[PDB]
Amino acid sequence: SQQVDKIKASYPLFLDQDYKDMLAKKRDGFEEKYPQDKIDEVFQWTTTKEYQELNFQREALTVNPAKACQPLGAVLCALGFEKTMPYVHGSQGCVAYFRSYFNRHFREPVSCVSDSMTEDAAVFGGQQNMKDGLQNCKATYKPDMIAVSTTCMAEVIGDDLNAFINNSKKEGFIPDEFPVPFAHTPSFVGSHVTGWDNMFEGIARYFTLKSMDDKVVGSNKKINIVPGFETYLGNFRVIKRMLSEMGVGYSLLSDPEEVLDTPADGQFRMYAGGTTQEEMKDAPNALNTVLLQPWHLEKTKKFVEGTWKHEVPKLNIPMGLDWTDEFLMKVSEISGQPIPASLTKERGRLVDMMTDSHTWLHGKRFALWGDPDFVMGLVKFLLELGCEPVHILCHNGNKRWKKAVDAILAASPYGKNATVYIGKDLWHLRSLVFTDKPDFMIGNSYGKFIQRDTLHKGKEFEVPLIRIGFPIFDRHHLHRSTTLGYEGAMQILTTLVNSILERLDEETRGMQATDYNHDLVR
Amino acid sequence: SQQVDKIKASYPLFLDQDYKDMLAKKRDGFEEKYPQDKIDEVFQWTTTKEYQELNFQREALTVNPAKACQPLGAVLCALGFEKTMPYVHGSQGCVAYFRSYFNRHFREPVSCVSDSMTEDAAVFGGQQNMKDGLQNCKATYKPDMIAVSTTCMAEVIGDDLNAFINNSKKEGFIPDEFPVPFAHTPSFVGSHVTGWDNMFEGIARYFTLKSMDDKVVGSNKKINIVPGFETYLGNFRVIKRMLSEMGVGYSLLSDPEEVLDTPADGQFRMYAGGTTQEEMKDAPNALNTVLLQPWHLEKTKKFVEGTWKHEVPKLNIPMGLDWTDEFLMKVSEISGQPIPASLTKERGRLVDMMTDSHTWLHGKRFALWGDPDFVMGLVKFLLELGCEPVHILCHNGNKRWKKAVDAILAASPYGKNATVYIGKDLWHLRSLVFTDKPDFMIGNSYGKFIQRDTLHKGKEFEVPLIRIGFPIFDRHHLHRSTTLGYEGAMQILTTLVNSILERLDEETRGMQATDYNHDLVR
Amino acid sequence: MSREEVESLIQEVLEVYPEKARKDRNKHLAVNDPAVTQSKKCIISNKKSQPGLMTIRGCAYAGSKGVVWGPIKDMIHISHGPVGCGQYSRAGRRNYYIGTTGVNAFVTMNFTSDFQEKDIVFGGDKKLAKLIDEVETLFPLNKGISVQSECPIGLIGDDIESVSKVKGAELSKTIVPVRCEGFRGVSQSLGHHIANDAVRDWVLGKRDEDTTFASTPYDVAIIGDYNIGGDAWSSRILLEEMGLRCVAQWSGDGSISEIELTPKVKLNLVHCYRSMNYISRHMEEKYGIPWMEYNFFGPTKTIESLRAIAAKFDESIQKKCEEVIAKYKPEWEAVVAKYRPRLEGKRVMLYIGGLRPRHVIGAYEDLGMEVVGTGYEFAHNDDYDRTMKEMGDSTLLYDDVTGYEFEEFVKRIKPDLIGSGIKEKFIFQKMGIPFRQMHSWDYSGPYHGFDGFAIFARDMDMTLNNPCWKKLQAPWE
Amino acid sequence: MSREEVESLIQEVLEVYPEKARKDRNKHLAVNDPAVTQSKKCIISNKKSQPGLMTIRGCAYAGSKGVVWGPIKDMIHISHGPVGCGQYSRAGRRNYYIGTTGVNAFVTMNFTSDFQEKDIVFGGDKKLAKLIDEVETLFPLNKGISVQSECPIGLIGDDIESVSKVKGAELSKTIVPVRCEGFRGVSQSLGHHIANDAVRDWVLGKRDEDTTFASTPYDVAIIGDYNIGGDAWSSRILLEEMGLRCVAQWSGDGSISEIELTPKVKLNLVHCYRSMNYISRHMEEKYGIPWMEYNFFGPTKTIESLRAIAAKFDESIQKKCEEVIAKYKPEWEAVVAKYRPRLEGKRVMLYIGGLRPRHVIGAYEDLGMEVVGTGYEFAHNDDYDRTMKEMGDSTLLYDDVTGYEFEEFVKRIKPDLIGSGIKEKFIFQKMGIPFRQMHSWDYSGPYHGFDGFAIFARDMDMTLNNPCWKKLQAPWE
Ligand code: CLF
Ligand code: CLF
Ligand SMILES: [Cl-]
Ligand SMILES: [Cl-]
Ligand SMILES: [Fe+2]
Ligand SMILES: [Fe+2]
Ligand SMILES: [Se]
Ligand SMILES: [Se]
């Protein structure tokens, strides 16, 4: 039933007695459900060290991964180029998923096409799909560039992207001059971040490999910035802002911040902003190239060093205090521009906030996950805050990266109780937060189910989620946030300390029981 | 007892069995405490409509006010001037409190002096305190200006500030040319906002009243901006940022943003930034003067209109979409500068966020409080979001203001269930959130005790607090936030919708009970 | 707009295309004529999508794993192949259920074989067998396993049927191989069919010779309701207030046992014709169980459906039917009285999958709204046959609409509201057109039944009449 | 630094001042000599503050309402006068209690008469009478009322004593008039004395003729512990493990009845001498109850205090004393073993109110730290007498220190840690000096007793050794 002036959606409608009774009858009549005592028994077992050890012995089963597949990253990379249509050669089901995944995180349109290869292409390959697809895409959506990646069908069948694109041009489906950079992006190798690296290196090759003869390193007086797979708008923005404040000439290569934040003013803008084709063509003339997320830009790095002859500096992601300092100092060295008074003051404001909030942060224990560069930067900043990053999970991490993070942990007393996990998933993480309970999780929206599981054991075992990463689907507009630079550090610090204080307020809200410590001032 | 590896602070130390037993014995032995049944009975009665009626008939008793006293506002106004020492003529106890109040909100030093009048001054007045106080303050803290207000002792005794300052200069305690603007700031008239108005009007008079003969309206081609009592750093910053983006010449009169946000770089800076004396002296040459918070700048308005001959525009506080639009359009008209593409895009990004989040905001009910201009801007923006601001409390509001807010409510269908309360306090508001329960409160840290009270009745009656206003003492760095302009609207929107979603996640976190609606995507 | 104007709109839009695409797309766009009973005279459907045109369609895996199998709550569904497909489809569809997740129910979890290069080169059958043992160890209360094949499985020549047979016999467990690789078919649709045939071949016959279930003359199953935001529950309640016994829900909040008990029912009630007509026809053929289509969107269709269902039973059910109708009468009437005046005359364009583009029209009309354009991602001509009589004369119909077409149609038609999916939502909001998600219900619902109609009405009103829509134009331009 | 260097520092700092302020401030600054027993030869205290110099002091209302009366949990305390004083002091001091706030306890609430102009011009006595009736109606479980006078009350000639007597008799209610107006005295100190005399005159004698209390030989009261972060509870626990019965706590977590029962005890245990010596002397004079000063900061002082207290009773209590000491020995030894190596040799400067600037020195020394400067806002020479033997030779002492002085002393002395208040905290952090709040415990504590020492040690370590302090200098400057 409904009362018209207070209509109930599913919650709390289905808590009405009639619905409750109905659901009980469905269960008892037809579901042959395990008894509640058995459900409780098994649940309790899944929180144990015994279960954890079985869980960590998995070789074949993955449960609740913390990674996605290559072409997702290729699409994101492509979106950052001016009037560029991402195009995934292969199966259309993939593109519906890539678009929806990003739609839900950014709350924005996400434009991407497929060439709709079907079962029939297993005999003859996807050449005709490429020919008609490129022609159709160019005519219908009027991009100035089409950036081509692949789905796993196309990789398994073995379609030669290069030959297919060349033949599309030769047979007149698109003009010779129309830019069609490409990358093979197999979903069964690496992860979404690898797809970004592959796509970017493909675009870089397209615009520069055959035109190197006229290039002089340093001649355009700029620094190239390659952001990698990045889903916070504030991160593209903060890097541009800091470089502008410093008077440093730069080119941000892959910059989707305009197309992922168009105004609602009565028109839909399929394309906005982005890195220009000329910025890619002219990039070898830069003083150097800086990689913001080096642990998923290794292929890009080899091309930039081997072909552009740029001496790519050894810089960590610019997250936290020390690594933002190091980034700015290196940029100063490369450009000849001093670090300006404005950034020095901003730095000191971050340090002020650290001094103000250190007492609530000290010794707080975190479980966290994400992509390799994000995770190591978060780990570094947590150590700077006097926090303990006890469970560090990077599903798509590698052994070399893990060694690097282990060394960072060894450099600080706050790393003593920390372990780094690679190739492990959120079902593994779930066990760790039961058996070695931290104070909080820092992760993406898939963490909410771990919080739910921990509360079910009891309020005293609940591990609240702090949402930082990708994807965040269950809060609005957190994609506008910043994690890089002093600005990002100030945002992360504020989020962490207030999450701590919110939880403490919850635990001390009990009248005459715990509210002796429900302080007005903290 | 303590375990050295895991030391317990008050929470949860006093939940240890030995402490629990001790506290039970203290109660039973010596406290002669009312039986718990009686406490429960009285608690339940305090949640009733019967109790609310009695509560609202109060004439003499105030409980949990949502206002402070005049000189607090005078001190904040004074801090916004370059190298200026706030100086409160009267009792020193007051100044300890003003500084600590602001210390806790900004987590920053707050410098202010007293001249330490004692009981003896009731015979002879505070003239000697002023003489020595001004001399001592100038020599010791080396301000370029001392801005004088009063405590209530000095008002009751009837000290003539003007004569006392003039005699201090006549007798050589400070140089004749040294700026000593003043304002009488009785705590028993109006509130802290009135102190700000009085202080500002005193400073404006000091620098302009005797030099009007050479002034020509519009000759400097700037607009003066008077911000009023403002405790969000982001608000001073956004106004300056928007005017700069427009290419509008301006002078922000009282600007404490630098002195309330100094870097932690190894030195203490007693003074930083602020409105210059030269800006105050030149202010009558502006095109016009815009008041950001007109409902507590009525004395300032009369001086600016009557003496400077500026036709102060009738603008509401620039909060929400319509009033930010109106502000920018009026600034455009006065300055002759068009609204630039950057601000047009920002506006459309706010509208985009509104379209993205409208389904969770729609029909949500709020209780809220604060100063008059802040409250009316919040009400307006809530109506713009399709929310219902059902309990609007402004302790320091007046009848004319209430009529203006009632008009705003009348212009929208979302105002139909709203009532505006003036002269009422947070004990009044407590009753309203029991008898006519909203979804949330938007208010300052004093609201936490109301949330605590509502939870004690039951989880289903709990009204969570969303912290926006002054003071906020129990979270860190929220004073950095913004409530004005499109940026402020974006911040408020995000805070509101994610408060809603946080609560929904709490309510749907119950395994097999309510988690059918614990959606990954919202 | 007139028929002639709509025809010229179609022609103007198609001018952008190269010849091959133009000629194809012309066949998938039509101006409705409700006199037509053979839609194969007016529109082509269920063909391949043209490359490069930004179809909104998904794949057969979405149709099998995402749609049919994934909701079955006490089984574990393996996304078998590389990591992408299972991650993007993890908890994206609001197929609601009651259970203890990770313990006896598994719907919002993502189980996968996370194929790496060595699995592609040498095959994944050994990995699948090991994966099954690991599932059994860590999730002992699972009541069956399905294997949802992603693109590589068939392409590399893996034999998941053999693995399912062998491991099923070893563990005395129902393990269902599903060949729903996204290279198969042209859309989600073939996934439904594949998934239905897998239920038939591996699950539905388990209790054929088992007569322990005590049947009544009033036993029914809800076939093709995936319980989006609780839709099946707000339908079930009405059927049982009418005196029927709902033995099974396929597959929203569904259990393996209720699927296995379905061949014991007296009548299959089909909501989603597109996705589950296959198994409904099978059950009539094999077990003699009749099936009937029904519609629980809005009071008019719900009342008609309750009466048509009750007419298949005796006077006692027909009497209870009228008792149910009388109970809810004042409730939906109050909804209409409040919201119809706020929505009267407003025009809506829809684009959804295989059912809702026709099924929700009645609900809109119960609020005085007019559906001026509709279409489907993956419908067949039998769906279009059912659509032409539901739509008004000279309205616009689109099959497998392209992004370009949908935008250009909206620009000319200027609907007051659009009802479509997540890939569509933010485009149309930026154009100043109120948008409601008509797959996920925009995180609201249920929309089925009398209780759902209240929420549907609230939702269309909150969005169409929201104050935000008056604010898109800056007052200075 | 040597004596001559500290002397030089004092003269250098004093150079800034005009002659009158210079001559005054010189009398309030001294180099410690622990051979001195008469501090009146070395330092002046409890005088007026010099105008314009940024004293850190508060007023008599803070000392009465904020400090002595406000913590009493089952009474309602009216901030009588304009709105400022009650609002700034609302819940700023962490005087912890167990109760149901707004129902039977009222500590964190702000009750005020919110004086307006008409109240100043015509008097507030009628408003106070009406206010009392409104309190009784809305807060019926209150067990008494205090009237905390703010500046205007005495200045305008109001008679709160008459109102209290008349309304008290009418309502059979303890209503206490407190003349703690901020114009009185020079600091918080006179507020203590005024407050003690009000307890004496209006509360303490209520049960003088009542013989119903079941007394024991081991009855004590804790006098002058305001339970900051639970300090009184972590002291109480030890006294009762030693076999004593704590009849009252003045006034942290204090009730009116336990104040009224205090004249029945055998011994008054005085922690805060400055605030409560007045009533302790009164109770010895009138009731013959002895009193003794003690110190529960750190293990050395706590052990000494427990033994000295036990010595006042019989062998059974002295036996329990040694049992308590043995119980906690491994606990505090573990704290010292963990934290003393992290803090050994570090130098601290303190500035606090009237007790803690001397009382915490032993706790610092138990962690190997050195207190190189200390001082008080409002101490009297009897406090300085007790201080000079606790401080090292040639250390710096400051009475009513000015902001300028404190900053300049710190610049030269370069302590590793500063312990002071909220108005000092952020100044010294910006200078790169670790700071701990030694009024509010920086929202931590308790610090009293054995359990408190663990938290104290943890806190000094977390702050002094925090990684933030190595980061204030940008690597490019
Ligand atoms: S039609 Fe899968 S998302 Fe693709 S590139 Fe392979 S991992 Fe990644 Fe359908 S079954 Fe899936 S969703 Fe596509 S691959 Fe095929
Ligand atoms: S010494 Fe009160 S804060 Fe003042 S101006 Fe009057 S309202 Fe405001 Fe002490 S008793 Fe109080 S705190 Fe001062 S006034 Fe006196
Ligand atoms: Cl889950
Ligand atoms: Cl309170
Ligand atoms: Fe958006
Ligand atoms: Fe600060
Ligand atoms: Se899960
Ligand atoms: Se309260």
Residue numbers in the entry:
A (entry chain D), B (entry chain B): 2 to 523
C (entry chain C), D (entry chain A): 4 to 480
Can you provide the manuscript's text about this entry?
The reduction of substrates by nitrogenase entails multiple cycles of association and dissociation between two component proteins for sequential transfer of electrons. In the transient complex, electrons are transferred from the [4Fe:4S]-cluster of the homodimeric Fe-protein to the MoFe-protein in a reaction requiring adenosine triphosphate (ATP) hydrolysis. The MoFe-protein, an (αβ)2 tetramer, contains two types of unique metal centers per catalytic αβ-unit: the P-cluster [8Fe:7S] and the FeMo-cofactor [7Fe:9S:C:Mo]-R-homocitrate. The P-cluster is the initial electron acceptor with subsequent transfer to the FeMo-cofactor, one of the most elaborate metalloclusters found in nature and the catalytic center of biological nitrogen reduction.
Se, a structural surrogate for S in [Fe:S] clusters, has crystallographic and spectroscopic properties that make it an excellent probe, hence, potential Se containing compounds were investigated. By screening a range of experimental parameters, we found that Se from SeCN- could be incorporated into the FeMo-cofactor by incubating nitrogenase under assay (turnover) conditions with concentrations of SeCN- sufficient to inhibit acetylene reduction. The 1.60 Å resolution crystal structure of Av1 (Av1-Se2B), isolated from assays containing SeCN-, revealed that Se quantitatively replaced belt-S position S2B in the FeMo-cofactor thereby generating the [7Fe:8S:1Se:Mo:C]-R-homocitrate cluster (FeMoSe-cofactor) form of the MoFe-protein. The essentially exclusive substitution of S2B by Se was validated by anomalous difference Fourier maps calculated from data measured at the Se-K edge f’’-peak position of 12,662 eV. At this resolution, no perturbation of the cofactor structure or its environment was detected, reflecting the small increase (3.8%) in the ionic radius of Se relative to S. Except for a low occupancy site (ranging from 0–20% under different conditions) adjacent to the previously identified potential sulfur-binding site (located ~22 Å away from the FeMo-cofactor at the interface of the α and β subunits [Spatzal et al., 2014]), no other Se sites were identified in the anomalous difference Fourier map. Significantly, Av1-Se2B retains acetylene and dinitrogen reduction activity when compared to native Av1, with the difference that the activity time course for Av1-Se2B with acetylene and dinitrogen exhibits a longer initial lag phase than for native Av1. Consequently, the ability to prepare site-specifically labeled FeMoSe-cofactor provided the starting point for a structural investigation of the active site during substrate (acetylene) turnover. (A) Side view of FeMoSe-cofactor ([7Fe:8S:1Se:Mo:C]-R-homocitrate) in Av1-Se2B at a resolution of 1.60 Å, highlighting the S2B replacement by Se. The 2Fo-Fc density at the Se2B site is significantly increased compared to the S5A and S3A sites.
